Amino acid sequence: SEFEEDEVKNRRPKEDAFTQQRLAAINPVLTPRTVLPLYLLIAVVFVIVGGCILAQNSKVDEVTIYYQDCMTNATSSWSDIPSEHWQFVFHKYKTYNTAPQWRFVDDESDDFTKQRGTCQIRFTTPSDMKNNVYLNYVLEKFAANHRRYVLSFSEDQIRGEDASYETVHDATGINCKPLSKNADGKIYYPCGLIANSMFNDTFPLQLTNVGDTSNNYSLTNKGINWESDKKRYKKTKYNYTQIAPPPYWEKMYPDGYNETNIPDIQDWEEFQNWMRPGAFDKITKLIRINKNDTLPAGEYQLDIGLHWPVLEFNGKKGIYLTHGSHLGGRNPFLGIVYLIGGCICAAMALILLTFWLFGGRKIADASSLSWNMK
Amino acid sequence: ELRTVYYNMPLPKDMIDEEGNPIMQYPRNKIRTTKYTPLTFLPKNILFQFHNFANVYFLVLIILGAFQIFGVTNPGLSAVPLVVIVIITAIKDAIEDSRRTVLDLEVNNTKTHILEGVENENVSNIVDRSLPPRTDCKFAKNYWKGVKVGDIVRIHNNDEIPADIILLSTSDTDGACYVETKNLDGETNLKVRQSLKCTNTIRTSKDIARTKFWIESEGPHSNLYTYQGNMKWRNLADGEIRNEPITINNVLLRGCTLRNTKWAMGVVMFTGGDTKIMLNSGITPTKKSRISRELNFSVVINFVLLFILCFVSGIANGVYYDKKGRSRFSYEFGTIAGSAATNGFVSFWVAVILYQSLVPISLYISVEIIKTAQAAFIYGDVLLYNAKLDYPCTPKSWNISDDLGQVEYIFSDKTGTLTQNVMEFKKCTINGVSYGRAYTEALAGLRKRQGIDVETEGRREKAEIAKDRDTMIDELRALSGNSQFYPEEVTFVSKEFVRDLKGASGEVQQRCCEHFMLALALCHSVLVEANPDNPKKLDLKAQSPDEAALVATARDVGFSFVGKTKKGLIIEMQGIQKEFEILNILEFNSSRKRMSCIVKIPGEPRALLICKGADSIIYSRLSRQSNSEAILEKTALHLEQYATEGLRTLCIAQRELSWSEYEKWNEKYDIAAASLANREDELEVVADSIERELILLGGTAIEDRLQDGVPDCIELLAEAGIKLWVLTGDKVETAINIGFSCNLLNNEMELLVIKTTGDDVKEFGSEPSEIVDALLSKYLKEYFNLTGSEEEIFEAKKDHEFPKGNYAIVIDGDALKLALYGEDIRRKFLLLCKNCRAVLCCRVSPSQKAAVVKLVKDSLDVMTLAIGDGSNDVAMIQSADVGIGIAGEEGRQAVMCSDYAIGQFRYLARLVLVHGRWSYKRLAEMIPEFFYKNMIFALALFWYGIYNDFDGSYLYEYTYMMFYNLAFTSLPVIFLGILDQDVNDTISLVVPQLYRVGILRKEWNQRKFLWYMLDGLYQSIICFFFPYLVYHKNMIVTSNGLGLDHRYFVGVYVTTIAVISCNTYVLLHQYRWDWFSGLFIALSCLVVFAWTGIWSSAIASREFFKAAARIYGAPSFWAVFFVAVLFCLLPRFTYDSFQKFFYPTDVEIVREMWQHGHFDHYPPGYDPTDPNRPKVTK
């Protein structure tokens, strides 16, 4: 009855070089006859390159003078700069000495007793500097790389906007936090610590030829920054009634901003140079350039108006006059390190060849396998 | 815990919980093999993820930042990477567990037949013919999950049993039933279950509907050999209780399969987790690979380095903020603030945020990607796919592939994994003449060890055997027309046998052979039933497969066993049928090791007592007067030979009995059989009377066929250094037979048996657990010099070399109970098996298999692998570092509850060796490398702190800090972790000794991790201080003289050096340089340059607005670039060359041999374990 009724009632994986782990490949086994030539190739030509770099680096001649002690050490009469303040490097003339001179011309009209007057610096160059002469300024011990300092500016104000107070003060990440607005309630136009503390010394638009003043060497503040930077820096759209100068720019703008005097930060390449803070403790920024004429051998004078204080923090400020290299200034590191690398490669090649000629084994030895020995 | 089950009866008042619902609830009949429950997936998975310490670090950083905010802030996008990575890992784990769920569902939806029309009260004579019959009562098709305690179930032939049920009645009158228990133990025999005597007369749904009863049972106790219950009903003539005791003999368990039975009817007692197989199973653990735990320790070392950096940063920053004459007092509006210690505290926690990257967020997602891809490449392997089952190697667990590279011990189930369940009559010795040609793979391996080139020898011998076989079949057909002769199933290959059965060796040999085959066709318990498809075909239904093999050979040679009359059997001899008359049958017994039949020989007729039994049992019952005493020694020699070849052997002896003798023995046996009070020993003494005299006429030899390539795979894994222990639930003798075939056990090898036997109980001690201890200590002191002591186990942990000495341990389950009981004897047992190249634990329960794996795993901290089919190996397999299930034609719980599932045992080698080696290596190289690469980048932030007074400005632009680990340096290390091969798969199977490295754990340590950390530290120094030393003199690094001073531009210098150094380092530590990984290395470097270009060209990056143009146009950048990459890569490359040249590793030597063509004669996909294997030149 019920029992009778109950009685009555592919995956093969794809064969493929990829899925079967059989891709086309080389298996590099390193043997001395392939490794030692590589070592020698690297050695030989890292030595070529290091020698060429060191050779082209010796040709770099430069002038450095730290004038931070000009108000107190210099006098009203021409006096040699102490040896600790200058460094000359001329490669045709390795025994120069010929100390530079400086003179302090005080300005009692100015009431900033910390930095005032003009430092006149006379230096003699025995050689010519190429047709592309850079007058940089150096700062020592000014820290432009601290956490709050380095984020203290408005990108909205750099980009030409008439940024609100909240846009300027309460922006995520970078914002000009301690310096966004003055006690009256006007927004600082270049807000932030970076713009406030802009280097202030006035550099001349020429090098006075002390011998023949009929031909003075001319310098420019145009072309001292990348030109593409004018795509990022824009002339502001503020209205001179919304903005005020930074706190430390108030000797520059005693009345404040008004109709004509607002700075054009697009044309102001010193401002754009300062707004790029230095990564390290020594800060070099281009301030003057001559792309036309060679600076012939002779004695020149540089008159710097002193407005920026450094002696509070034992800092230094100086001038650095160069023509440069393709690798930058004069720095022997790259050549020394290319030569060291070539010599280390050659030494390892020789050491391995020596260890091979004496304790060199046989290559394809199934007898040296761990199990065939034990 | 006693549970009463009422059928067709209302539950008593005390058993109901007040609302028509019984108190006791019984678990659903559903099986669960998933790691997680649907409601426990998220807590458990997130906890598993947060057992990685770097995840707790990431969580802590975000939490701390958000409540406090402090420096940097910008919360919202800070918590996103961790949440995304945790969600993605949870999704991967859920997809894995969903595959397991699909298999569970398939098992749960299996069909059963459950009685309908009678309400199951338990879960929301005896039969009364007077009660009205209900037609709606029928056995309805249902699912396995629909089965509940108290349901009446009807199981058809070859139907798997859905729950633990008690047999009520079977289609056979008297209620006998056969079950296949290969799943619950290793038994190859069918087990006879018996139905209860009272319910035997019930064989319809209607009778079972009119019936009432209730069973009082004990609870579920996970002892496969014990059950105790009591069925109680009321007599329908007289109202009173009648009780029937239920043994394990009446019970069908969930793992078994009904066999040779039309149907079997029973009542369910246990369901789901209450069944004995599920009580042995366990709950499918979440396995973490070994390298992952060691990775936790590596991450902690990285935490310590980060703490030291942040401590230095905070202290130096406080010391600086205490100073005077600083530009911050003039230009930053800076004031010296009180509590310089709390300012050092703020600086510490600013530095923690600065140096976050030191612990990389991409580490765990990268390891998970690599492991998932490794599992996918295992699954996509075509040499791991079994065409016959249509089954690829399926990874069940997608994170433990590198465990397969470190395996030292393989624990193997003997039946159904090592062996295919096929028995073949191979050889037979008749009158001291051996017949049968056989060429195993075991003999091929022995002879290969001997030296003989066994490719040519084996193929030639197989051709000889096939030719002899065809000759034999044609000569058989010509000898006579046999109705049941089917040549497609012949396994006896003796040409000489049939060529001798006519005339060859003389008429005495003629008659000896004929009578031997006739006695094989007479003395047996095989049943013949017509094939369903072919009416003329017979199917030879037998309880023992060896008996079926013997009768099948007797049929093929021309002594066919057909049908069964009321008396005797009809045997077709050479095509002429004659029925015999069976006087008596003395059944086979586990206690007798012998079967016997008595036949009538016509005249005054005579009796013929034919006795079939084990070689020693029969040899003991033999005549001194008569036996040729030459046939005796020849037969013993043949049987020893056969047993060495791994064949189970029997002897057969006939005694001719005078009529007088048989009348007396028949009547004595009749009294003994009618006698009550344990008639068993009555029949024992009477059968002992009759059988003590016998004339040995011959012996047989049946092979239990192993799977293909099992001795080859075992020898490969032994050359790799892996020890194989065989744990069986089957008898010792079968395990020893299998061992010889496997080549695990050879002649000239000592068998250390840990017998707890009474006769040697007389010798060693008083009673067991003293005698197991005595035997362990005696073997330990005798054959080796060491005893079980903590220092000896300590010293044994140190050496992983394969054991020498030619000893093999043989323990049964009784002795293993004692040897695993106490800690000191556990030490002694582990030490005796740590030597002793072969270990066979026979007659062992699933709990004991798991216990042995755990003993080897805990003592001797080592990687283990368990492989098997069935529910014993479920417990063995879950408690192992890698559990492997072997897949069959039907669903298996060992396959469901495993990590990998292969179609054949033979894949172990190819899968285990190739994949294991690649994974162990791929992960090893990948994980220090990761920590190396990240480290370079991150450490430059710390070096920049030396110059910013540890204040906390960043050297890097923020897009660099995300795209370094996301895009610039991720893919090289990931593809090294997924696609790296040191040698190809052919060499991995040709040189299995390359595996030993993973056993020794040479590839991965914390020493190598610290060396990579030191290299990353050195290279971070180079990457930061070479750009710094290019800047430091005058800060002018450009030809034009324009400024490149911004820290983001120095960071571009640093970052380009770090990326190209990192990627070239990763490429140099790759063994194989394929077009794919190389393409993506080149792309990673190009991507750093291309991102700088694309991002800079935009006004969106405010201070990085032209970093690409200005920096990549500078010859300074390229000068430092080349020399810094040289100085970063040179020390390590020089170390690697000095190492390859003077202290090469074995893989280095093997790759040199590879380049010189030592492996050029091997085909690309080369399986040395494959039987259909193309001959290799040398």
Ligand SMILES: CCCCCCCC/C=C/CCCCCCCC(=O)O[C@@H](COC(=O)CCCCCCCCCCCCCCC)COP(=O)([O-])OCC[N+](C)(C)C
């Ligand atoms: C288009 C991309 C290139 C394609 C390449 C192929 C990619 C495939 C390979 C993948 C390997 C794994 C890579 C690691 C992932 C994290 C990267 C990282 O460094 O996180 C950084 C932040 O990252 C962000 O802030 C991104 C902001 C949006 C969220 C994007 C999720 C990132 C990937 C989620 C996972 C997705 C993986 C899913 C794959 C199945 C954190 O590091 P840090 O910045 O140094 O620390 C400072 C913290 N800070 C940033 C807050 C200051």
Ligand SMILES: CCCCCCCC/C=C/CCCCCCCC(=O)O[C@@H](COC(=O)CCCCCCCCCCCCCCC)COP(=O)([O-])OCC[N+](C)(C)C
């Ligand atoms: C949503 C899907 C859930 C399933 C429901 C769908 C139902 C149908 C959908 C069916 C589609 C199933 C495809 C899933 C991929 C693996 C499957 C597989 O075959 O594994 C194999 C093992 O081999 C491996 O180990 C592969 C490694 C895992 C890759 C998947 C990781 C997911 C990444 C997460 C990143 C998160 C990304 C963030 C955005 C989401 C074994 O599997 P199988 O048992 O042998 O069966 C597969 C072949 N068959 C099907 C023909 C029999």
Ligand SMILES: CCCCCCCC/C=C/CCCCCCCC(=O)O[C@@H](COC(=O)CCCCCCCCCCCCCCC)COP(=O)([O-])OCC[N+](C)(C)C
């Ligand atoms: C890519 C560009 C760079 C992008 C960078 C991104 C990062 C780098 C990414 C790199 C990815 C590279 C890995 C390739 C995957 C292996 C391929 C393979 O062998 O096929 C196998 C895949 O088996 C499957 O069924 C499908 C699963 C494939 C993907 C699963 C892992 C993905 C890894 C991501 C991890 C997931 C997230 C993990 C979260 C923790 C087998 O296929 P089959 O057997 O031939 O199919 C036949 C099926 N049949 C049997 C029914 C017939």
Ligand SMILES: *[C@@H]1O[C@H](CO)[C@@H](O[C@@H]2O[C@H](CO)[C@@H](O[C@H]3O[C@H](CO)[C@@H](O)[C@H](O)[C@@H]3O)[C@H](O)[C@H]2NC(C)=O)[C@H](O)[C@H]1NC(C)=O
């Ligand atoms: C050139 O740059 C100088 C540094 O940026 C700047 O010095 C700053 O000058 C202002 C005056 O405008 C000083 O302001 C404070 O001076 C005293 C002393 O505390 C207070 O009584 C004032 O009310 C005011 O707080 C700054 O202290 C001073 N900065 C430093 C670092 O000394 C010069 O003014 C600049 N000169 C020109 C010509 O622009």
Ligand SMILES: *[C@@H]1O[C@H](CO)[C@@H](O[C@@H]2O[C@H](CO)[C@@H](O)[C@H](O)[C@H]2NC(C)=O)[C@H](O)[C@H]1NC(C)=O
């Ligand atoms: C070169 O520079 C010098 C100094 O700046 C110029 O000399 C000055 O000339 C003005 C008017 O001629 C005088 O009032 C100053 O007294 C001069 N200063 C000195 C130091 O001599 C000179 O004119 C410049 N040369 C040319 C060609 O213009």
Ligand SMILES: *[C@@H]1O[C@H](CO)[C@@H](O[C@@H]2O[C@H](CO)[C@@H](O)[C@H](O)[C@H]2NC(C)=O)[C@H](O)[C@H]1NC(C)=O
């Ligand atoms: C080098 O010569 C060029 C060409 O005359 C000078 O550039 C001009 O400078 C004047 C400023 O006096 C500008 O008004 C012109 O627009 C510039 N012309 C061009 C084409 O740029 C430059 O000043 C000279 N440099 C020096 C140091 O004298």
Ligand SMILES: *[C@@H]1O[C@H](CO)[C@@H](O)[C@H](O)[C@H]1NC(C)=O
């Ligand atoms: C000039 O400097 C020197 C040393 O640098 C010092 O000895 C001397 O006192 C200084 N002169 C004046 C006037 O301060």
Ligand SMILES: *[C@@H]1O[C@H](CO)[C@@H](O)[C@H](O)[C@H]1NC(C)=O
């Ligand atoms: C704007 O302010 C400057 C400050 O020097 C002053 O010289 C100028 O006269 C002002 N503008 C007008 C229109 O007067």
Ligand code: BEF
């Ligand atoms: F299947 Be085994 F014999 F435990």
Ligand SMILES: [Mg+2]
């Ligand atoms: Mg099994």
